[PDB]
RNA sequence: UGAAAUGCGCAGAUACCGGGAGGAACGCCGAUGGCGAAGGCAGCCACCUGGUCCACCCGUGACGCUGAGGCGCGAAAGCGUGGGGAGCAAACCGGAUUAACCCGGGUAGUCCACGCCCUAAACGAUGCGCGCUAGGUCUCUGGGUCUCCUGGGGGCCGAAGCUAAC
């Protein structure tokens, strides 16, 4: 129900600069925010595959911004895996 | 809203005006067709009405 | 916070008091469910599109008010368990239709 | 993605069609192309405009006299327009190894060591590059 | 059903009227329709949740595209456990025809949920699939605009390709 109003945080909050509504970080942080919700769906309608395949897309497509952020500067991409406690 | 202004569609309440089953009417008829439906539910006549 | 709209029906054979109670205790059910009654109208006695319980007709009721969005399925049925009350119909936004 | 081969395309879907001109991401190594083929006949010529702040190549198609007898759809001068060396299949020649356009009448595209130029210009120059493609 | 048998035979049936209990499937609108990864899904309503389209056009910045293993998964179907009811129904039973699948009764079974399983599908727009390019009129769908444009479906073409579906 959620995922209306907290965005403005969750940007601001990975945003490099005033205006950063977009960067690899954001996009990241808000991506996941997303497959947390998705996840916490599954998890009570099991039966939902549709939703189910959504969030493979989320994750397929976030690992892909984080080896990016990886081969092209490994230093935001150590503290981006940390402050979302991917991997600790 | 936006329903040719003389009154919504989706107005299910006062079925003072009679509308069945029909086919044509106008435009998109999607949203009152659930409309008819919500009233045959309270008190909308489902025989059958030509 | 959503917005909903309710429509009840009760039995078309209550005094003003029986009604009034009723009344007294749906309102009441609505604000334990975090309803809050934006609005209220007595449509009057109608007719049904189907008799319930031998009843071709009976009094039907407005309410509209915006209660937590996961808790209206605990409404309605707080609601239909009562004898009097026929039959209940719940929607979205403000005025039903 | 092939730029190249994109834009020959371009140039044969607008003769078959009858323009008189069509639009080409602007680009170095495709100007040089078109200004070729322009300098043989190929394309009556090119120039550069700017579409909302956004560079292309345009060409002019050139066409020739008129058939012979009551036929509209005029004689056209491109009767062909592929790629050779492309993206994956690299295709290289030598001075030596130069290949052999459509008797004369026409040009290999050849991306020498000395610019983008064609089948004699680097049989003459004796270099070797790319066979980007043959147009006839 | 064109025939007839079968069945109805505690009773008083079947087509009648009202009420009661249970289960399943869910009309008109559903339409050359639409959505979704496929399957599949269409009484309605609320909630959770996915994908996709369009607009202004700020931001991060091609972090791209296809794609073998792997993982999940298809109508009907068989198989194990728990379990209630209804419709239909192949093996089964009977009349007839013959000298057979049409009709009648009909249990096992088919059903729902979990698990195992997961073919030919659909379609032929599938060797996948992406980008650009050519391109008019008519009917229909969505958004912002309103001789428009972006994104679908159907019908008749022009160029070109395929003679060997014309």
Redesign the interface.
């Given at each position: 129900?959620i995922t209306k109003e907290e965005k403005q945080k969750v940007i601001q909050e990975f945003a490099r600069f005033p205006g950063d509504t977009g960067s690899t970080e954001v996009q990241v942080a808000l991506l996941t925010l997303r497959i947390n919700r998705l996840s916490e769906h599954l998890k009570v309608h099991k039966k939902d595959h549709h939703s189910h395949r959504g969030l493979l897309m989320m994750v397929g497509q976030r690992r892909r911004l984080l080896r990016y952020l990886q081969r092209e500067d490994p230093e935001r991409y150590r503290e981006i895996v940390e402050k979302l406690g991917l991997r600790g | 809203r936006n329903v040719e202004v003389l009154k919504?569609f989706?107005?299910?309440?006062g079925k003072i005006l009679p509308r069945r089953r029909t086919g044509l009417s106008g435009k998109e008829q999607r949203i009152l067709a659930k409309?008819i439906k919500?009233?045959?539910?309270?008190?909308?006549?489902?025989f059958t009405e030509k | 916070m959503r917005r909903y709209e309710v429509?009840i029906?009760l039995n078309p054979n209550l005094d003003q008091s029986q009604l009034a109670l009723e009344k007294e205790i749906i309102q009441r059910a609505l604000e334990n469910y975090g309803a809050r009654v934006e609005k209220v109208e007595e449509?009057g006695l109608?007719?049904?599109?189907?008799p319930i319980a031998k009843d071709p007709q009976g009094y039907?009721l407005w309410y509209q008010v915006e209660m937590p969005?996961?808790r209206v399925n605990d409404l309605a049925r707080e609601l239909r368990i009562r004898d009097n009350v026929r039959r209940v119909?719940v929607?979205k936004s403000q005025?039903?239709? | 993605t092939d730029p190249i081969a994109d834009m020959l395309t371009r140039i044969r879907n607008a003769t078959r069609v009858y323009k008189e001109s069509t639009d080409v991401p602007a680009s170095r190594f495709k100007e040089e192309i078109l200004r070729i083929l322009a300098r043989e006949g190929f394309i009556k010529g090119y120039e550069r405009v700017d579409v909302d702040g956004k560079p292309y190549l345009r060409v002019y198609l050139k066409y020739g006299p008129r058939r012979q007898g009551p036929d509209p759809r005029p004689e056209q001068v491109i009767h062909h327009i592929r790629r050779i060396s492309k993206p994956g299949r690299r295709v290289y020649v030598g001075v030596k190894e130069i290949p052999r356009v459509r008797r004369g009448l026409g040009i290999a595209i050849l991306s020498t060591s000395k610019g983008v130029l064609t089948d004699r210009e680097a049989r003459k120059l004796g270099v070797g590059g790319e066979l980007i493609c043959e147009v006839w």
């Amino acid at each position: 129900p959620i995922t209306k109003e907290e965005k403005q945080k969750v940007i601001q909050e990975f945003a490099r600069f005033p205006g950063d509504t977009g960067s690899t970080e954001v996009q990241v942080a808000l991506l996941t925010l997303r497959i947390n919700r998705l996840s916490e769906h599954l998890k009570v309608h099991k039966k939902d595959h549709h939703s189910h395949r959504g969030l493979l897309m989320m994750v397929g497509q976030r690992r892909r911004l984080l080896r990016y952020l990886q081969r092209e500067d490994p230093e935001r991409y150590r503290e981006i895996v940390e402050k979302l406690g991917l991997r600790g | 809203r936006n329903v040719e202004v003389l009154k919504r569609f989706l107005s299910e309440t006062g079925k003072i005006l009679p509308r069945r089953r029909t086919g044509l009417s106008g435009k998109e008829q999607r949203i009152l067709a659930k409309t008819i439906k919500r009233a045959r539910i309270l008190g909308l006549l489902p025989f059958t009405e030509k | 916070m959503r917005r909903y709209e309710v429509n009840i029906v009760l039995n078309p054979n209550l005094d003003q008091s029986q009604l009034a109670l009723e009344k007294e205790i749906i309102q009441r059910a609505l604000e334990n469910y975090g309803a809050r009654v934006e609005k209220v109208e007595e449509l009057g006695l109608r007719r049904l599109a189907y008799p319930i319980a031998k009843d071709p007709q009976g009094y039907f009721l407005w309410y509209q008010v915006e209660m937590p969005e996961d808790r209206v399925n605990d409404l309605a049925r707080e609601l239909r368990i009562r004898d009097n009350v026929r039959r209940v119909m719940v929607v979205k936004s403000q005025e039903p239709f | 993605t092939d730029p190249i081969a994109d834009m020959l395309t371009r140039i044969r879907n607008a003769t078959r069609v009858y323009k008189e001109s069509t639009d080409v991401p602007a680009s170095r190594f495709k100007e040089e192309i078109l200004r070729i083929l322009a300098r043989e006949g190929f394309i009556k010529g090119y120039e550069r405009v700017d579409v909302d702040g956004k560079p292309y190549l345009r060409v002019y198609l050139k066409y020739g006299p008129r058939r012979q007898g009551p036929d509209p759809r005029p004689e056209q001068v491109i009767h062909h327009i592929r790629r050779i060396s492309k993206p994956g299949r690299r295709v290289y020649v030598g001075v030596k190894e130069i290949p052999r356009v459509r008797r004369g009448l026409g040009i290999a595209i050849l991306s020498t060591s000395k610019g983008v130029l064609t089948d004699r210009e680097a049989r003459k120059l004796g270099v070797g590059g790319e066979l980007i493609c043959e147009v006839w």
